[PDB]
Amino acid sequence: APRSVDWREKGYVTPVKNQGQCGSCWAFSATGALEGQMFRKTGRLISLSEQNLVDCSGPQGNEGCNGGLMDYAFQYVQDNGGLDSEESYPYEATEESCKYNPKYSVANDAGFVDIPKQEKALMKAVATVGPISVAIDAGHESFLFYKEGIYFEPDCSSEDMDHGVLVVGYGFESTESDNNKYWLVKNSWGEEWGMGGYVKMAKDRRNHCGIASAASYPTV
Numbered sequence: 001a002p003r004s005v006d007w008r009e010k011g012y013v014t015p016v017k018n019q020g021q022c023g024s025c026w027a028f029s030a031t032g033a034l035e036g037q038m039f040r041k042t043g044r045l046i047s048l049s050e051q052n053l054v055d056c057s058g059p060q061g062n063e064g065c066n067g068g069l070m071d072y073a074f075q076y077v078q079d080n081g082g083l084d085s086e087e088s089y090p091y092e093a094t095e096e097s098c099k100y101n102p103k104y105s106v107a108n109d110a111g112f113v114d115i116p117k118q119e120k121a122l123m124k125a126v127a128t129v130g131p132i133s134v135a136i137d138a139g140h141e142s143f144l145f146y147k148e149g150i151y152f153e154p155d156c157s158s159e160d161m162d163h164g165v166l167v168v169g170y171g172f173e174s175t176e177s178d179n180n181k182y183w184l185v186k187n188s189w190g191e192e193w194g195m196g197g198y199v200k201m202a203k204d205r206r207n208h209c210g211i212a213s214a215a216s217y218p219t220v
């Protein structure tokens, strides 16, 4: 695998979005992964509707602003035969009745692939597939105030993740502790959080915060 990957340089990644006060992280992770795979197929980057997932993917097991799983969203796009664009079905940060309209659907998938719970396997998927949906333990003040550098939280759990996000690459930079490797992660808290909405999360530090315990991507 390469030592460094950044799919934003290849056109796979929309700008950072903001989920607001709705527990819809899982929807932003899923649209990020599907936005990348759709671009890989068609060469056109189109922002996808998180509200469409929040309002409509209940039958697959999602619970709107109360939580959900990226895999369930991928299952919805497959079952439903499509997913509306962000512009056609904009984000309201509140759960409402499903307003899906297939005339405005711009994405499809035929399932999803769950990545083995290994950072080595996650690296190979990021290097060969595109942005990857992952879940992390974001439940620490240190994560809220992250600003730069490689994020490392000693109290981070590798088993109880609460926050779905998107791995868009990985890389390295020299650090005091010589733990130099990171995952490049797109968050959904707007661009004022972190590094323009991104975080460099510790890579190859024993599945730090569980980043490799629930990684997946849709099949397009």
Ligand SMILES: Cc1ccc(S(=O)(=O)N[C@@H](Cc2ccccc2)C(=O)CO)cc1
Binding pocket: 023, 024, 025, 026, 066, 067, 068, 069, 070, 134, 135, 136, 161, 162, 163, 164, 214
């Ligand atoms: C109290 C609470 C409220 C909402 C959520 S969440 O649904 O927004 N976050 C997801 C993230 C996730 C975790 C593992 C695998 C995929 C996605 C979950 O933890 C799902 O159970 C979690 C906790």
Ligand SMILES: *CC(=O)[C@H](Cc1ccccc1)NS(=O)(=O)c1ccc(C)cc1
Binding pocket: 019, 022, 023, 024, 025, 026, 138, 139, 140, 162, 163, 164
């Ligand atoms: C992933 C998501 O949408 C979360 C849902 C959540 C998770 C834990 C506790 C309350 C709500 N929303 S979030 O704003 O991304 C977030 C809030 C709090 C924590 C500890 C993590 C993430």
